[PDB]
Amino acid sequence: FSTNRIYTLRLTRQFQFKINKQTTSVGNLIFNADYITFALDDFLQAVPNPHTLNFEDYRIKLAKMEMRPTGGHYTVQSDGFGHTAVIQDSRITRFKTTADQTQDPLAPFDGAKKWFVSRGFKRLLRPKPQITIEDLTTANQSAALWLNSARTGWIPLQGGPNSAGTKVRHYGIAFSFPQPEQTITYVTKLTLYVQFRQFAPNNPST
Amino acid sequence: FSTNRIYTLRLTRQFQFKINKQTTSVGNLIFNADYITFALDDFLQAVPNPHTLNFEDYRIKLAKMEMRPTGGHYTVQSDGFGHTAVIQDSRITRFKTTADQTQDPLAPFDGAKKWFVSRGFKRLLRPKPQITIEDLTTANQSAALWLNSARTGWIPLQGGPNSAGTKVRHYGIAFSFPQPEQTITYVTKLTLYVQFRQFAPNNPST
Amino acid sequence: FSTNRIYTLRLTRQFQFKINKQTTSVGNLIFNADYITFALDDFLQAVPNPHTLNFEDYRIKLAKMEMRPTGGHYTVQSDGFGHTAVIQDSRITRFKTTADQTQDPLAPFDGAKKWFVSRGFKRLLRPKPQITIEDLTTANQSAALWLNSARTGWIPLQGGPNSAGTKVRHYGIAFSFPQPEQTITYVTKLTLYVQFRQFAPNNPST
Amino acid sequence: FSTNRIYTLRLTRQFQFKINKQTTSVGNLIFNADYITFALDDFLQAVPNPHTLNFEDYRIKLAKMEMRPTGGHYTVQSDGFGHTAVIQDSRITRFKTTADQTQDPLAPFDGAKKWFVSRGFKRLLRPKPQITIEDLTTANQSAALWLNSARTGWIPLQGGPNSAGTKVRHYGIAFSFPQPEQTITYVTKLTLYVQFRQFAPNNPST
Amino acid sequence: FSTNRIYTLRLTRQFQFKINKQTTSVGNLIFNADYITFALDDFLQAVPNPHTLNFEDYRIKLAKMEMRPTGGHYTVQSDGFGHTAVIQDSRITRFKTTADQTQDPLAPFDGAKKWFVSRGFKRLLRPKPQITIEDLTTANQSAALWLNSARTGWIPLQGGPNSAGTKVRHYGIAFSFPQPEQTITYVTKLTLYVQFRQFAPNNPST
């Protein structure tokens, strides 16, 4: 039971997602996209999970997204195919489309994988936290950097000036779809595979 | 034909299960759950099974639950996915939910396994009987303990002050589900793989 | 991440203990004794520890008691020697002496180990939970039984009719001492080495 | 004599520490704690050390804390035992207790190590600098990350907009103690084992 | 980084395709067909792709066509089978039928592979650019030749009197279908696997 003792937990949460009936540019093929990011706090605040953990540091080795249709949608009712893409930086926010796309906005990505709208998808990835760089050629601007291996660093749960280590946003997976003729509802399940370092007491009483 | 002669039987029973049309929080994703426990008497009292066995002891090596839809439900009509979980103590009783859950109540369990509402599931487990402990730090309260291996102990069919050995409750499997848009009926089949020890006569005449 | 996934934690708590100045049978050698038992709940209720754990079962592999003098007592100030003894059943309650003993009440025990009053002691043991036996030759009486190996069974945290699995009392260590000429205060630290089985969600919302 | 030429130095500083006579809840066992962090500037500003170094980068491979009693305190006068803990993030600041603790606030830590109040302690550690993350799920908040190996990065002594590279705070070691019956004064010695990269000139004249 | 440095990219674009409800020769089996050709410019003009590439030469090593039904068409709804055929010259233009065929117009082709109307198809091919021959036995007529291996030649992006290297038409894939009883809409995804030679600057400023 040393300072560097490691523990590994699996955490999950679920939510609903809707792809709306096509009501624009009717009769034509259009695409839209959304995305998901991963933060430990998102999973600890879920009702059935432990809301605090007695560990000093953590690191997300792996994340999983699984979206499957519900609401009585027929799997054999073909509604075309879109793509998933692993986007491991904050650029992913641009891929929640605010306007109809005339092409699949994620298909050109290296690593883009096809998925059929009526079946959903399942994909694993290594989501990345974003380290800060403030020394840019333009003043008063910052950029990001992320590490190739999760074993390189640790995120303290209560480190930093906000004690908000569990809220670090790890990027990230996006998914696109051709707009269907009828609304489709999905059940989404996210999973985190997290390593924790150093069992720790509660903060001292004040 | 010694005192420790062993016999093995397979026992089964069936019953109907209903997942009700969602009539609460319509438009939201909600989850509920139920559970099953195993007792030898539950199977011997089934109509087509032998209602009494001429053995002195028994032990349940393995149990099995299969739930498949009926009532004309389409397997290709997707209604999301829930989870099954092996819960081998009386805590399982809390997982027959009495209120709608905003998250899958069983997914966080180690060993939780996904299953699709429209296809049902099949799972095998080693259900455990609960040994009594009455020496707790709070007076007049009791707790439970179960044994890691079924080969460790035997249960007399007629042992104890009530001769109710066959009614020992073995835990246990729970299953959760997102509430669907229509009612779904299932056929559930349970199977016990039971070892019996010592062929025995009837009780003496009185 | 299976049903049988195991985790191991170290838990500790501390408290003060006093051996009072001898005020009886003055000038003569007398002995007294006290004892300690181990319950998981005792450690989870300690301020700096997690007060609930999200595991389904547990088992105490090892327990440790360490009592050391404080309050400015000189280690080189000899006050004789007493004994520690591992007593793994409820008989230990008789060894909190209510009357002065003319002999060391724990020395005859097999496994009794000497300890010097002015230095304290440190001892590891395997504490035992007490399984119930109610079939005795005398009516309306029960007795106990404990298992040789901790790997034999599991205690569900919320199992039993009281959901008080963490309050099972594990026996046990006692310690005796010759009554000193002046009061001595000690700091006692207990440690549990506990294996937990099956990461589990919170109980469903009601 | 290349750009990546490395030099290693040992640096030290000392200071006094006091554990105060217990004047609150007299008669009860209470605990308090304090902590130490490491910054190169803390050592260079010490009177007998070089106040500026002609190197471009540095990295702290190892740090060391030794606290031994003084003021005439007897080592054979027992005052119980507390614990030391390696806490490598800014959470350590909470472990300078501002209120009396009823339990040892550091004992539950993985890696916690006992130490006797009357003898002091000595412990080595790998203290960590905190890298900034500004992309959290809560807007305008930040968190930290540190690297598992000191060989992964270098800290420029004069890098950044403030040329304050030597002031990076490396975490960290905390120590707890039961409050004694009399005041105890200590001499604390800290030691840094620091690698430096690239012998460098003074800044150009202006 | 030599003149012959090669880069390889994957490029994709999508569009809609309709097979119209049969309104001619009703009650009888009829067939129609269409075709696709490949030009780098077709993919660079697509909205999400880079519209200019800074390379000197290119060559298409592989092309892919995937057409899948959408619009709510049931995959389990049989509508017969047609064929795909790789036609690597401009004769393919004749196989966009302008009159109903009483036989499958592509089935006789060597390499013809059947596909079911209700599931779509996926086929890979090596599309061919057409080299000009003007020396024919008939005056003022020209013919075509293509090379067996893609490694034999390179197409400069801006070569020729029109700088229209990216507009070379590569042949080619055709697909036939028996006319269904109801209209069927498809999503079509084309993919190019293109090797580029010699990273190049922009054209000089004028």
Numbering used by the authors:
A (entry chain B), B (entry chain E), C (entry chain B), D (entry chain E), E (entry chain D): 42 to 247
Recite the paper's sentences.
Here, we present three high-resolution X-ray crystallographic structures for distinct macromolecular assemblies of the capsid (Cap) protein from the beak and feather disease virus (BFDV), a circovirus infecting critically endangered parrots. These complexes include a 10 nm assembly, resolved at 2.0 Å and comprised of two face-to-face pentamers of the Cap molecules, and two 17 nm assemblies comprised of 60 Cap monomers in the absence and presence of ssDNA, determined to 2.5 and 2.3 Å resolution respectively in the same space group, arranged as 12 pentamers. Each Cap monomer was comprised of a canonical viral jelly roll built of two, four-stranded antiparallel β-sheets, with sheet one comprised of β-strands B, I, D, G, and the other sheet comprised of β-strands C, H, E, F.
Five capsid proteins were present in the ASU, with the unit cell comprised of 480 Cap proteins arranged as eight icosahedral VLPs. The assembly buries a total surface area of 182,920 Å2 (compared with 13,650 Å2 in the 10-mer), with a notable shift in the ratio of intra- and inter-pentamer interactions, the majority now occurring between pentamers (68% involved in inter-pentamer interactions compared with 40% in the decamer). The interactions that occur within the pentamer are comparable to the 10 nm assembly, with each capsid burying 1,934 Å2, mediated through 22 HB and 4 SB (compared with 1,660 Å2 for the 10-mer assembly). Each pentamer interacts with five other pentamers, and every Cap molecule within a pentamer interacts with three other Cap molecules from other pentamers. Two sets of these interactions are identical and together bury 3,390 Å2 (through 52 HBs, 4 SBs), and the third interaction site buries 774 Å2 (mediated through eight HBs). The diameter of the VLP is 17 nm, corresponding to the size of the infectious particle, and exhibits a volume of 2,171,590 Å3. Differences in buried surface area between the two assemblies, 182,920 Å2 for the 60-mer, and 13,650 Å2 for the 10-mer, suggests that the 60-mer should be highly favoured; however, analysis by AFM and EM shows a higher proportion of the 10-mer complexes in the absence of ssDNA. We proposed that this is due to a destabilizing effect caused from the repulsion of the highly positively charged ARM domains present within the 60-mer when ssDNA is not packaged (overall charge of the virus interior is +1,960 in the absence of ssDNA). Analysis of the electrostatic charges on the interior and exterior surfaces of the particles revealed a highly positively charged interior surface, and a possible additional interface for DNA binding. These positively charged surfaces are distinct from the positively charged ARM domains, and mediated through dense clusters of internalized Lys and Arg residues (R46, R51, R100, K102, K105, R109, K154, K155, R160, K163, R164, R167, K169, K230).
